[PDB]
Design a protein around this motif. Sequence first.
Motif, mmCIF file in Angstrom:
data_model
loop_
_atom_site.group_PDB
_atom_site.id
_atom_site.type_symbol
_atom_site.label_atom_id
_atom_site.label_comp_id
_atom_site.label_asym_id
_atom_site.label_seq_id
_atom_site.Cartn_x
_atom_site.Cartn_y
_atom_site.Cartn_z
ATOM 1 N N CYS A 139 63.722 33.004 20.628
ATOM 2 C CA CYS A 139 62.860 32.093 19.913
ATOM 3 C C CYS A 139 61.437 32.588 19.914
ATOM 4 O O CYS A 139 60.887 32.749 20.997
ATOM 5 N N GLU A 161 62.225 31.911 7.186
ATOM 6 C CA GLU A 161 61.385 30.723 7.374
ATOM 7 C C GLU A 161 59.936 31.104 7.700
ATOM 8 O O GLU A 161 59.016 30.451 7.208
ATOM 9 N N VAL A 182 60.407 20.838 19.390
ATOM 10 C CA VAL A 182 61.153 21.510 18.331
ATOM 11 C C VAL A 182 62.462 22.015 18.906
ATOM 12 O O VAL A 182 62.482 22.527 20.029
ATOM 13 N N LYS A 200 65.134 24.503 17.352
ATOM 14 C CA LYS A 200 65.517 25.401 16.262
ATOM 15 C C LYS A 200 66.819 26.108 16.594
ATOM 16 O O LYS A 200 66.946 26.699 17.668
ATOM 17 N N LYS A 201 67.789 26.037 15.673
ATOM 18 C CA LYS A 201 69.097 26.656 15.854
ATOM 19 C C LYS A 201 69.018 28.162 15.653
ATOM 20 O O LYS A 201 68.463 28.609 14.649
#
Lengths: 212, 218
Positions: free
Chosen positions: A139, B128, A206, A208-209
Motif C-alpha cells: 500500500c 487510480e 481508508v 483499499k483492496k
Amino acid sequence: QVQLVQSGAEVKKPGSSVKVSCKASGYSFTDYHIHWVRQAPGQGLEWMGVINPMYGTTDYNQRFKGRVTITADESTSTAYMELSSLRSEDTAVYYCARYDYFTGTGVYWGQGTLVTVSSASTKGPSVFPLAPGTAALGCLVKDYFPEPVTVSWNSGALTSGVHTFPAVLQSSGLYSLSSVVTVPSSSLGTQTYICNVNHKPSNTKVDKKVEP
Amino acid sequence: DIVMTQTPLSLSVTPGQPASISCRSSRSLVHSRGNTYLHWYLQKPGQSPQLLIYKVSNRFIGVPDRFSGSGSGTDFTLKISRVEAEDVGVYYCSQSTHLPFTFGQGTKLEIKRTVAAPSVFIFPPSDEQLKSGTASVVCLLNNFYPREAKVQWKVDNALQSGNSQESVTEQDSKDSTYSLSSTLTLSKADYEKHKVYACEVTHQGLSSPVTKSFNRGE
C-alpha cells in the motif's frame, strides 16, 4: 491489566498550547504517581514532570519555565499535560508513565502522542495499491501531514511479514510511506488483501483492496 | 541536573555472544541504605520504553536472567549474556534519586547476523493514482543483511538521478534483517513517455546485480 491510553497525535501552530490526556485503568488511580516524559524525533528521553493524583501536588522540570501544567481527574482516571507557547523544539512524542515506590520508576507507559509544532495545515493521505511461489504486495500512502499514519493488514489480523516503512518528507513538505507484506501466490486469490490505513490527525480511515 | 553518560553509543553483536552497556552519573545515585535508583530500559522500534532492571540489579516481571545489572555510586553496567534477535532496540539508563529525573542518551544494539540477499520486487503506479497527475514507481528490497545496498532506477535503460527517495526499516526482531523501499516519482505525462521501468539492486549477498522490471501498459 494496567493500561495507560493517550489521546491522538496532532499538529499545533507555533505559539499555541496543546493538552495531552492519559487514561489509566486496571488499578486504583489515586494510589500511583503519573509522570510525563517526551522524546524529540530520533532523540533521547526527557523527563517533564509528575503529579500525585491523591493530592493534586506537582513537581516540574525547571527547564520548561512554567510552560508545563500536569493535572489529574479522578472521576475519569485521566491525567493531562498542557504545554504552552509551543516551540518547533517541542515537536516530540509525549508519554505518560505510572511510577511506583517498589521500583522507584516508570513501569507502565502510554503508547505516546506525537505533537508536531508546525504552521502547515492538516492533510489526509491518498492510499494506492502496490499489486503483485512467494509474492509481495503493499500500500502506498501518500501526501499527508503531519505524522503519523498507522497501517494494518487484512482488517488488523495479519502482522507476519509486514514492513511499514518510516515516512519520508517530500520536497512538497508532505509525507509519504509504504507498507508491504510478503504473502504466497496461492493466497492472492483466496484472501482479499485489505490494507487498513489510519491518519488520526485528519480522521481518515481508508481500506483499499490490493488485487492483481 | 544529573548527567547520565552511557557508553558505547552503538554496538554490533553476534547471536549467542554477550554485550555490556555502561552508565556513569555526574553524582552519586545512592538514596539511602539499600536504595540506589538506577534503572535500565529497552525501547524496541516504535514502542514505548519497557523496564528491564530497576534499582541497579532487580529484574522486572518476565525479564530473563541473561539481563543482569550491577554497579554502585556513580558507575553502573547492564550486561546481556547470550544476545538474542529480540534484544535489538535502544537501551536507556535512568536515575530517579534526584529531581529532575534523568536518562542516558541511549545505546543502539544491532545484531550481526549472516549475510542475507534481498528479495527484489517492483511495483508500477496504480491507474487510480495516474488519474491524479502523478506516478510513483516502487522498488522493494525485502529481508536483507547488511543494511548497505545500492538501488539504481533505469527508465528505458536510462539511469535516473534526483527523482527517487529511499526508506529503510529498523533491524527486525525475529530474523535481524532490514527492508528497504525506493520510490521513483514522475508526472503522469513523463511516465507515459516510456516502456520499461527497472530497478537495479547491488548488495554484498548478490554475486551480480539483480534487476526487476515491467513494461508499462501490461
